[PDB]
Amino acid sequence: MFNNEPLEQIDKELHDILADEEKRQRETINLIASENLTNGAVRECLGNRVSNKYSEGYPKKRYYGGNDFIDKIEELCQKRALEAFNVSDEEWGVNVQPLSGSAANVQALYALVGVKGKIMGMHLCSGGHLTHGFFDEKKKVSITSDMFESKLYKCNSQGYVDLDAVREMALSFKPKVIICGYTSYPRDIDYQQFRQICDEVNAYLFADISHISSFVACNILNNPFLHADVVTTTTHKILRGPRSALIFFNKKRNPGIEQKINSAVFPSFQGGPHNNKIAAVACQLKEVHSPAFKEYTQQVLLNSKALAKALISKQIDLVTNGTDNHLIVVDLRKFSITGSKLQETCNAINVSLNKNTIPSDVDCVSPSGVRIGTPAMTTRGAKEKDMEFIADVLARAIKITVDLQEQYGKKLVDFKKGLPGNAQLQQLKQEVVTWAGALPFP
Amino acid sequence: MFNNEPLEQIDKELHDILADEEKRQRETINLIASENLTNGAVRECLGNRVSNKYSEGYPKKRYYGGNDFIDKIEELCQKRALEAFNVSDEEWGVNVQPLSGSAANVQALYALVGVKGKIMGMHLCSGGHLTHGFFDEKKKVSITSDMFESKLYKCNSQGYVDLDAVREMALSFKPKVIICGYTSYPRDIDYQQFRQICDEVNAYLFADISHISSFVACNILNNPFLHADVVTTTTHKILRGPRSALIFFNKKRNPGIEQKINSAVFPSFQGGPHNNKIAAVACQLKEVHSPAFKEYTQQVLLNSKALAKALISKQIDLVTNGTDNHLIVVDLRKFSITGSKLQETCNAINVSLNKNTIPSDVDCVSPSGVRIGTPAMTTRGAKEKDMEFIADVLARAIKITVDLQEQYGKKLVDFKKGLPGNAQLQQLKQEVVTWAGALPFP
Numbered sequence A, B: 001m002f003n004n005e006p007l008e009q010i011d012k013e014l015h016d017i018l019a020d021e022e023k024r025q026r027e028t029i030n031l032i033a034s035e036n037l038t039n040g041a042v043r044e045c046l047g048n049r050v051s052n053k054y055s056e057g058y059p060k061k062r063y064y065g066g067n068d069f070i071d072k073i074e075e076l077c078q079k080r081a082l083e084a085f086n087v088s089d090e091e092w093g094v095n096v097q098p099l100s101g102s103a104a105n106v107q108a109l110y111a112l113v114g115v116k117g118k119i120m121g122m123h124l125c126s127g128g129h130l131t132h133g134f135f136d137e138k139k140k141v142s143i144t145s146d147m148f149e150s151k152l153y154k155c156n157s158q159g160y161v162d163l164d165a166v167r168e169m170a171l172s173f174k175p176k177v178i179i180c181g182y183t184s185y186p187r188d189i190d191y192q193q194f195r196q197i198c199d200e201v202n203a204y205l206f207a208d209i210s211h212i213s214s215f216v217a218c219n220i221l222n223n224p225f226l227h228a229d230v231v232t233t234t235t236h237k238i239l240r241g242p243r244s245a246l247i248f249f250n251k252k253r254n255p256g257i258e259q260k261i262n263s264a265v266f267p268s269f270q271g272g273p274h275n276n277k278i279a280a281v282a283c284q285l286k287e288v289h290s291p292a293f294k295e296y297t298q299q300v301l302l303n304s305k306a307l308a309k310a311l312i313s314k315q316i317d318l319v320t321n322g323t324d325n326h327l328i329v330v331d332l333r334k335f336s337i338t339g340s341k342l343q344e345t346c347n348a349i350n351v352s353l354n355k356n357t358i359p360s361d362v363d364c365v366s367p368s369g370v371r372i373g374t375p376a377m378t379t380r381g382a383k384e385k386d387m388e389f390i391a392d393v394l395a396r397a398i399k400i401t402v403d404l405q406e407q408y409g410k411k412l413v414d415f416k417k418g419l420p421g422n423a424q425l426q427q428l429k430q431e432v433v434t435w436a437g438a439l440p441f442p
């Protein structure tokens, strides 16, 4: 007693917007540092009937039966996760149930500290995540600043984590957790130095590696699993999986952490896991442990170096003057245009990027930068030689943005009136679409 | 630079478990009250490339651009939701971003009361959800009992919500929210009477309708939108959508609630929404507003009544001696077998059901009942006449379960040893498989 008519027949209205969405993806230069493109096999998992099943609890300790095939899938996912991140399952555990990155972080933090517990993370404006304890004078913006008592550290004037300031803050604040790993930090992390600071005050070391997960997995960047008590990561950014998350916990350093984390995820915070997610995560993690994927990750970094170099060649400033990873933050202060103006300009030319704060910015109103990254375009087949074209398109968007600011003025409402119909944008959009449109598309 | 080989080719290991799991579903009498089966079009949405997009924020107030097509999908979903539940978009708002039922409840509760806020819900042992404030003498099991201060109301000896106990508790406890709508409650709810209790103490009325959502949308059962401040619901149970959730809020009755709830979902708790989920929710919500789906929901109730009646005809006791909805709780005390035993026996015959407390049980340890429901088998085409066969199969399972307990003893470890290779189970399993396998499968 159901309608099994295909999506196009059942709902033509929805199917047109989704076919439109797909066209826009195929014809966009996607520089969102956090975005990627899933393959068909991952998308077959996400649409699999396995999501019909309720499987509350954990494998071999389920509330319901009928979960033997679900149990194999969840155990396969956990093992492939540990294999992927070069960890022994005798020393490390993984929970694969968190529905997304923010949920994973709130759950892990709760496990370690409980309500009113003390946490330390990087300020949002300096490249930390919202779930790393973010608040504002106006409000406790994240639950992580409200259900916990948080204190926030800044990066220095050159865009670098200031360990001396982290030390100063930890000794006066005495937190139970210190969070590292960030949302828009262009350099590698000194986890060793973080671990030394956590020992000094007796806090746990939490590494959120969502942005750099593939660099850790493939031994291209520093390894937080050598020093951290907990590692969280999303599966959807550079890892190129579905939208989900993983919490890793160090059993050897913390006996009985396994129960704290598993009970935090369920039944403290979640109900039924989404088994289509877990299935999809299994599928991608098998690709992650191939040497073919180490090739892809290596290319991400090669494109990112090449892009940073080409942008600097065109006299565009980068925060920390370069990158050790997949992402770059452009400092737009020498042009006297804000980040949101360039995002608007880049939207008009099918270039996807986001506004981003820089060290000099005190207020999240009018961030002076944009963040860009290469995972998506690297997935679509772009090489080092292709980064000059992207750098050129970005230089051309900055110049147009500067022209429009002079013509229509510095206020944002006025500025946007300048965008539609602009011959140069229409021309530049055209060049973008034609180039992006041609690239392989999963 | 990706592997686009189909799932069978790229991961033959995962694909065999999935193909097995699909067979187990096709060959099971699925009586899980919270389960259903998604059609092909909803599963096309869940595997759609729309999940590649990061779209933090709300439509027309997004942190990024490139979200024109995402915004159309999210607005279509909110509209179709309000229409489905017969509410005016001038008086009611809806948030469609929550990733699951539990997330939605925690978010909504936080919005209304904040950290340390006082909440009241039905005890879990009496049929409430974990996210309705559940705790135990050993621990604060849910976050909703920990981030909030909760008090839990019981149902009476006959399995009914005891309003005089709710009132007495509300007046002494003075909570900011009173939660109604349950996980295993076989009757309709007196929302009007709850509204009268909340008004008396100046608390919000929160209706969790996840189990009965289709009955509310189709006007078959009472309408909580007449009296509630907030209504939450999952989209995956009787509604037959993907795994996601909805939070409804009464703007007329509470000016300024719209902001409290939207901000609580993001950026307080979540990050990026899962747009495949939202697309999927949109697709199903179109089906919900057809008269064809009203027919389906009517049949759910018809099958549930017929099933209740056939079970009573065979001298099986039901909590509250019947049902007003899709679910029944069987009271197994007269046979001296526990709910976990019958769950194991039913697993052995490809009958999916869960163990469930009954009023007499002091503890959640050794529940004396099972919960069953008709949405899944109603989706598979079963009619009133087919309920006698399910009732037959269930009575036969109880009798086998009673025999095995005699033979191997009342201890669960001893009991289970009698299940593999039992001639009658192999026989009964065989009958189940043959009948179940034949039914329409979406």
Ligand SMILES: Cc1[nH]nc2c1[C@](c1cc(-c3ccccc3Cl)cc(C(F)(F)F)c1)(C(C)C)C(C#N)=C(N)O2
Pocket: A124, A125, A126, A127, A128, A129, A130, A141, A183, A184, A354, A355, A356, A357, A364, A365, A367, B056, B063, B267, B271
């Ligand atoms: C959207 C998001 N999520 N997590 C995030 C961000 C970012 C961000 C957040 C926010 C914001 C501020 C207050 C409340 C809620 C939010 Cl989402 C603002 C901007 C700005 F527009 F100002 F550039 C940007 C970014 C990646 C887009 C961010 C930065 N920089 C970091 N470090 O982390």
Ligand SMILES: Cc1[nH]nc2c1[C@](c1cc(-c3ccccc3Cl)cc(C(F)(F)F)c1)(C(C)C)C(C#N)=C(N)O2
Pocket: A056, A063, A267, B124, B125, B126, B127, B128, B129, B130, B141, B183, B184, B354, B355, B356, B357, B364, B365, B366, B367
């Ligand atoms: C699994 C689950 N989620 N939400 C739930 C349930 C149930 C349930 C919960 C629990 C439990 C108890 C303590 C801690 C954690 C959990 Cl998950 C136990 C049982 C039992 F097996 F004993 F019958 C059952 C049910 C639907 C399966 C339930 C009941 N009854 C209710 N009212 O609500």
Ligand SMILES: Cc1ncc(COP(=O)(O)O)c(CNCC(=O)O)c1O
Pocket: A033, A034, A100, A101, A102, A103, A105, A129, A131, A181, A182, A183, A184, A208, A209, A210, A211, A234, A243, A244, B054, B270, B271, B272
């Ligand atoms: C370090 C980090 N951790 C957690 C999250 C949360 O993931 P979900 O959105 O799945 O909740 C993000 C989001 N990153 C947003 C961005 O960089 O664009 C992140 O950057």
Ligand SMILES: Cc1ncc(COP(=O)(O)O)c(CNCC(=O)O)c1O
Pocket: A054, A270, A271, A272, B033, B034, B100, B101, B102, B103, B105, B129, B131, B181, B182, B183, B184, B208, B209, B210, B211, B234, B244
């Ligand atoms: C009333 C109610 N509310 C919220 C939830 C949570 O939904 P998620 O699992 O999507 O978090 C449930 C789950 N119900 C479990 C069952 O009845 O089988 C529920 O019964």
Ligand SMILES: [Cl-]
Pocket: A046, A274, A276, A277, B046, B274, B276, B277
């Ligand atoms: Cl999903």
